[PDB]
Amino acid sequence: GHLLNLTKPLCEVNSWHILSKDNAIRIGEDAHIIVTREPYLSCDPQGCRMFALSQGTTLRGKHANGTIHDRSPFRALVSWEMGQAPSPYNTRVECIGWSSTSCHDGISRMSICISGPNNNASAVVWYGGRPVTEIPSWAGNILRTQESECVCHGGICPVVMTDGPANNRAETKIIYFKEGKIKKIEELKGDAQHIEECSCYGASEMIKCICRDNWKGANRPVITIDPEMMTHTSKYLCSKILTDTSRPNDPTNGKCEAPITGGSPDPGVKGFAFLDGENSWLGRTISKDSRSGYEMLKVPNAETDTQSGAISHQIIVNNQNWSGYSGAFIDYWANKECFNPCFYVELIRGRPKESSVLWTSNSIVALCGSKERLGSWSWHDGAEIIYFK
Amino acid sequence: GHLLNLTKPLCEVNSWHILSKDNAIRIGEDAHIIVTREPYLSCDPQGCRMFALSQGTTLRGKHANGTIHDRSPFRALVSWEMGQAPSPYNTRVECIGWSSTSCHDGISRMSICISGPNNNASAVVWYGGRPVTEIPSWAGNILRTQESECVCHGGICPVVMTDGPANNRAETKIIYFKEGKIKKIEELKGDAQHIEECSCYGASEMIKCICRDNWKGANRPVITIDPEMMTHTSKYLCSKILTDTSRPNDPTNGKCEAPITGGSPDPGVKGFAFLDGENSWLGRTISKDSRSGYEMLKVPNAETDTQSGAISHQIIVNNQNWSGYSGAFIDYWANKECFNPCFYVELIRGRPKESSVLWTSNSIVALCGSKERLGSWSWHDGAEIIYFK
Amino acid sequence: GHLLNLTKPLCEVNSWHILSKDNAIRIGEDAHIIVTREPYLSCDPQGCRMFALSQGTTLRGKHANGTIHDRSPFRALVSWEMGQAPSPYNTRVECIGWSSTSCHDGISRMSICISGPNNNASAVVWYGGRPVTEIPSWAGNILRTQESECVCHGGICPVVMTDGPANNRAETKIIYFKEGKIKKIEELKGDAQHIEECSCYGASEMIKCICRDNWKGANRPVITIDPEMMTHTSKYLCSKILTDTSRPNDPTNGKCEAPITGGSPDPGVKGFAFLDGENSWLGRTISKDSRSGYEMLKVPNAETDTQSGAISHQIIVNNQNWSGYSGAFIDYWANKECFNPCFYVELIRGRPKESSVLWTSNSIVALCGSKERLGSWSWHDGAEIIYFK
Amino acid sequence: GHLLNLTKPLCEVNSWHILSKDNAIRIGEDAHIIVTREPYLSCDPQGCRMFALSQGTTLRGKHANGTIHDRSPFRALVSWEMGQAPSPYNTRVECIGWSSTSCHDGISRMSICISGPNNNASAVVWYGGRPVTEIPSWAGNILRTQESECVCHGGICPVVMTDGPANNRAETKIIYFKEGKIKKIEELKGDAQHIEECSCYGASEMIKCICRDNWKGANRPVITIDPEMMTHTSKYLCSKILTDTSRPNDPTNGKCEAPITGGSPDPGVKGFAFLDGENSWLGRTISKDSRSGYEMLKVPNAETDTQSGAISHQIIVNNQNWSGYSGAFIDYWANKECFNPCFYVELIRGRPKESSVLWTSNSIVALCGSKERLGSWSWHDGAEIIYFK
Numbered sequence A, B, C, D: 001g002h003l004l005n006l007t008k009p010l011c012e013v014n015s016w017h018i019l020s021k022d023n024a025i026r027i028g029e030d031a032h033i034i035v036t037r038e039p040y041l042s043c044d045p046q047g048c049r050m051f052a053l054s055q056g057t058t059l060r061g062k063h064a065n066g067t068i069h070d071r072s073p074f075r076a077l078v079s080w081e082m083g084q085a086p087s088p089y090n091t092r093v094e095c096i097g098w099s100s101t102s103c104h105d106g107i108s109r110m111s112i113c114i115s116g117p118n119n120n121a122s123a124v125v126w127y128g129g130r131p132v133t134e135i136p137s138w139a140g141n142i143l144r145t146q147e148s149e150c151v152c153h154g155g156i157c158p159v160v161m162t163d164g165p166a167n168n169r170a171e172t173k174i175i176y177f178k179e180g181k182i183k184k185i186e187e188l189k190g191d192a193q194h195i196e197e198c199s200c201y202g203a204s205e206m207i208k209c210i211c212r213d214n215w216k217g218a219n220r221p222v223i224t225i226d227p228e229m230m231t232h233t234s235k236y237l238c239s240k241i242l243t244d245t246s247r248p249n250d251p252t253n254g255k256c257e258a259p260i261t262g263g264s265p266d267p268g269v270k271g272f273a274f275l276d277g278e279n280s281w282l283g284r285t286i287s288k289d290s291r292s293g294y295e296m297l298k299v300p301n302a303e304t305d306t307q308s309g310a311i312s313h314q315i316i317v318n319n320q321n322w323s324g325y326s327g328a329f330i331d332y333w334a335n336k337e338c339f340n341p342c343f344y345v346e347l348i349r350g351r352p353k354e355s356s357v358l359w360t361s362n363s364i365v366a367l368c369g370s371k372e373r374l375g376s377w378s379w380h381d382g383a384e385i386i387y388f389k
């Protein structure tokens, strides 16, 4: 192949069309489907795949008991053909661990998995199916990364990683990879106070990462990365439309340079947005408290305008159904003259919200932009929890 | 590859030989087989595949309960290697939705899935494995399409779609795609009064679609499409041999220009015919009332002669067994100097005819033409419903 | 590719080494393994595959009940990667039917399946994955063919087919195929009185088929086919070592030109031999009455010497275990200067010999020649029938 | 491809990073996973695969009963994509038997399986997927080989095999293969007193095999092989750090030229080391008595210095968990200027240590060297044996 260069702008988006849905929990009620969480999608020149962190057991298996827990030696990053549900028979092991990112540079895939004990974790960086670089924890407190795809440009693939408290100031770094080797590392700079779980996309030779502040803000940090110069800046999303969970009600003015506090009971969830002037879209859970529902809001100049509000709206998952993490991806190899925004929603089933079962797992739904004004309906998980009792 | 051009005539057919049978319900009694309905086949230069609309569950799974229902967020168009039964392990997700068509232009496959709410559904058109076009509902009442393969000629792949009432006049359009993009759209014209579920095939640079009139006629509408001029005409199958279900008795004279009414209790079923002067074959269910049995009748000049009758007869599924939808396909890439007709029959098991189970699904049988005079037997589903009680 | 020509002689064989074993019944006690019978193997330039006639159900499925029966619309020829057990997930459907043969001509595979009712069955001949020729029953009584591989030479692949009584004179024909088209058909001629289930191999531009006389002989018929001249002759295997089942004791003299009668209670079983002068090997069941045990006997000049006996002996399946059909195959594309003989044994389990279960199925073992004098042990099926009760 | 030449030295190793983990026993509690033991890994130019000896049954199947037994006609060497668990659906049968080795020469894979009765076993040597050579037992007492990968150089792939007593002097040979054909055979020479189960790796045009003395020594034999001259020498690992199991306490001085006796109750376990001057690493079970736990010890000049001790430690499996066999492999086709050491640990579950179940099987974990000083945690099997009772 040839290296991906982010030469195209973003496509105009007026609504979202269905891309894929795996129905993994419905199917997994009776087929051999593995337990997962923290899914995402990532494309390459030959097609798009689903990704997630396995828990090393099937959904109906006795080892599904206790899968609310996030980190163990039995987790792995696995990928599979888009739309299928993940089984022990159709999944490729990308790397071993409990926090991950992956992206394709046009020639080969880079996958990163972090594993080990909380006080001394390590990333193993794979390129082209081999391991090539290892990175020790720098702060001794749950070294962790994006939980969705990275983005490459001219062979440089920046990745955002954090080590340190989840509830206080941490140590975040931007690592610039080439063939899975470190070309440059930067300490986080700018106004973002805390960085977790960045959802990133590229357009017009720049990468934007929309992340989770788990310490203070209900507004999301935004890291802007120049992959050719290998530099970054950070701020908060300016818009008054708040998109973390938990969050307070939308205030009259957002904040660019500082967190907006508030919300109960949880400090954060992975999410995303596409920031392109008038062509800007913010995703968020419908509930301001819980990971329930999911909606897309078109918010012109969300990135720069503190009073920017929504001019259009699409419900992706109604508020009577559980959502979860969400993130950005793009098919950078599509036959279009612009890069078309896509996103996924993790549809979490089981604990803590559904305590009648002993497990936690998820299914996936993914959508991409349309220039049309399409009708829509809810793409919820669809499984009956009673069937699992 | 190279673009398919429909340069060949149809082959002479004197009987039908067995092509494939998946035995899906027998196998699915104990293996992990997904619930489907609305199956078909479609070929490409490398081989032929089975296609159908999944229900997002396995046959033995608890979520099989309730699958009589036609439209949900859990359905998708899936394809698999011809002859296998469809499982979560061997199926490719073509697109997401509850009404579909698919065809190959010699270079790439186009697959179309319609999804969303009845009052605001949308088609997503995929080409080469990517989404390329979206079409919103134009009449706000269950946007829907062929449920068997489309046909391509010189890169133009016409598709018949309907939006509007199932029991009254609707809005049908002929959409001419190239690389999944719309080149032309036409409103239905001609004598056909209602168009559903067209079964199409190509020969000598023309495409014929034999459809289902769900409003009035027990004779089938025929849409004739010229793919290079991107124009069409429509009328009814002239023959007194009536081939919808339900239908009345075959009258003394058919009708070319109007529906022949009658039949109880059902308004229609998807079906097909091959219309080629003396070399013409009509399929229909054996029962005039119910989707039971299936027979092929050789009816010379069926397309044009209101007094045409059967000169030969093959029972495909005996009338002590359930059939279902039926449709046309051809392997346009065969090593023959003519295009040989093929068809499938959907073998529906479970509800509503078999109410001892909670689910509805099917298996598939497919046959192609022979110039020989072959013996034959019934190719029914073969599952024992008592085993599922 | 390039056409296979039978330019090499047979390899010297002094003992037999293990090639493959699928353990299908053992595995199928808990995994999704399909019920089969009449297995065989066949190679192509890329590798060797296993083949068999499916019954359209898994072994543990309720539809395994009644699989003692030989002919149904639910049977298919399937192939899979050598050594795996056949499941709904790893098997390729070659053609649909209840009697089959298949061979690769160096460029593409020809597969033939016969289906239909006993009085009007038909063969469908596939080449390169596509059906190309159909053959109607010529005698109205179970048209049937080899149940192991055919052999090709310079693009010509002869096949032996029989139509007519199983217990009286029948009508056998040798059909010479090219790209699955009939180039020539001959009626059986020579001294063989009844021909079933031929096991064929090629060497030095000639093909030999060792068959089953189900009418009279306990000695096996041998059809010698010249593929370039498209002619054949037939006789009986001359040796006194009788190799049908059931059979009487080996007499002081065999017969070349007529059947040796005797044996109780069964009229025949599919089997094979390699006939190469001093380098000749005969397979047979160990039991003279039942399909129990399996042994190889080196019988120099078996083909021509009525007094030939065994000079060496290898037990393949001990006589405390069930065997079944057996047949010849060769990897004609190996990197050797001679063609090495291989064979398989079908290890039949269930009915009629094991009536505590409701099903009949088999596993497979395959071996090839060695010039070494290797040690050996029994390669019996290995499943515990008590586990299935 | 091109022949692999061992032109590179070993990479510097200061700690070990996780490469793969299949979690086979956790998954196999409910999915169709085959029972195995004696696993390893081996790479080729396209990637790395897991290998092991199947027992011809699934873990949950009733035929899992009795799998503590090591040799049967139902075992085979199978391979699968690294990281997946082994099922009947994702495994390639390499050859049939109960002792194996496999390695890739840059062009094709050589796989060797031994089968047959204890007094008359035979090796079948496969190359490029075909059988090419057979080797009869030379001493009539359990002909057996490495149970981990061989190593190739310039098309020569030496393999160590033993025939004879497990508890007294045996007859070991070094067999030099090229395209699976024997180029040279040597009787074992040098100071090693008993050789089993060698773990081999290549560097700087030489091969080192670290084996198991089952007769006398708790120190491990080391065979040094020159693949281009096709010669070898043998001695013992000099270091006082003893790495067989069972073993006594580490003494003040090791022994180069003789076994160190002692230890209770078991005579040996397969193991490995990387011997590269200062860059030397030894693995062993943590327990001196039992196959429990696993640790890596960096022991400079372990190969030459009888007083060499550990300068660094990493626990791979804690001593509250079962281990098993362990062995060396390297991705010789990696994009590095050195060959990086890797190893696996077999994690044995069930009998004899866990007698609440009727079966014996394992999962696998594999790690490779890092120049970093990484943190670490235990990579134990992770299955709950209570779930299987």
Ligand SMILES: *[C@@H]1O[C@H](CO)[C@@H](O)[C@H](O)[C@H]1NC(C)=O
Pocket: A002, A003, A004, A005, A154
């Ligand atoms: C992207 O740019 C790089 C130089 O930075 C170039 O080598 C590569 O060919 C480009 N990729 C394509 C697809 O043009």
Ligand SMILES: *[C@@H]1O[C@H](CO)[C@@H](O)[C@H](O)[C@H]1NC(C)=O
Pocket: A062, A065, A066, A358
């Ligand atoms: C689930 O795991 C918990 C904690 O390890 C244990 O106490 C409980 O018995 C398990 N429950 C089941 C149903 O296996």
Ligand SMILES: *[C@@H]1O[C@H](CO)[C@@H](O)[C@H](O)[C@H]1NC(C)=O
Pocket: B002, B003, B004, B005, B154
């Ligand atoms: C079919 O016609 C198209 C366009 O007219 C041409 O480009 C193509 O090569 C033709 N196909 C073949 C197989 O010749």
Ligand SMILES: *[C@@H]1O[C@H](CO)[C@@H](O)[C@H](O)[C@H]1NC(C)=O
Pocket: B062, B065, B066, B358
């Ligand atoms: C089937 O679905 C109906 C409707 O939701 C439900 O009430 C019923 O209990 C279900 N039956 C079973 C056996 O799950």
Ligand SMILES: *[C@@H]1O[C@H](CO)[C@@H](O)[C@H](O)[C@H]1NC(C)=O
Pocket: C002, C003, C004, C005, C154
């Ligand atoms: C075999 O002979 C055929 C026809 O006699 C010839 O065309 C072909 O080239 C030969 N095949 C090989 C592999 O030499």
Ligand SMILES: *[C@@H]1O[C@H](CO)[C@@H](O)[C@H](O)[C@H]1NC(C)=O
Pocket: C062, C065, C066, C358
């Ligand atoms: C097996 O099939 C026979 C014959 O159809 C039937 O009478 C019997 O009920 C079946 N047994 C089981 C256990 O399904």
Ligand SMILES: *[C@@H]1O[C@H](CO)[C@@H](O)[C@H](O)[C@H]1NC(C)=O
Pocket: D002, D003, D004, D005, D154
């Ligand atoms: C390894 O050496 C062999 C023979 O000495 C040579 O033919 C081969 O090309 C070499 N391999 C590479 C990758 O250069």
Ligand SMILES: *[C@@H]1O[C@H](CO)[C@@H](O)[C@H](O)[C@H]1NC(C)=O
Pocket: D062, D065, D066, D358
């Ligand atoms: C396990 O196998 C043993 C040995 O043959 C047998 O005695 C026992 O009955 C078997 N147990 C089960 C539960 O099948």
Ligand SMILES: [Ca+2]
Pocket: A212, A213, A214, A215, A216, A217, A218, A244, A245, A246, A267, A268, A269
């Ligand atoms: Ca927050």
Ligand SMILES: [Ca+2]
Pocket: B212, B213, B214, B215, B216, B217, B218, B219, B244, B245, B267, B268, B269
């Ligand atoms: Ca009608």
Ligand SMILES: [Ca+2]
Pocket: C212, C213, C214, C215, C216, C217, C218, C244, C245, C267, C268, C269
């Ligand atoms: Ca006989």
Ligand SMILES: [Ca+2]
Pocket: D212, D213, D214, D215, D216, D217, D218, D244, D245, D246, D267, D268, D269
């Ligand atoms: Ca020892």
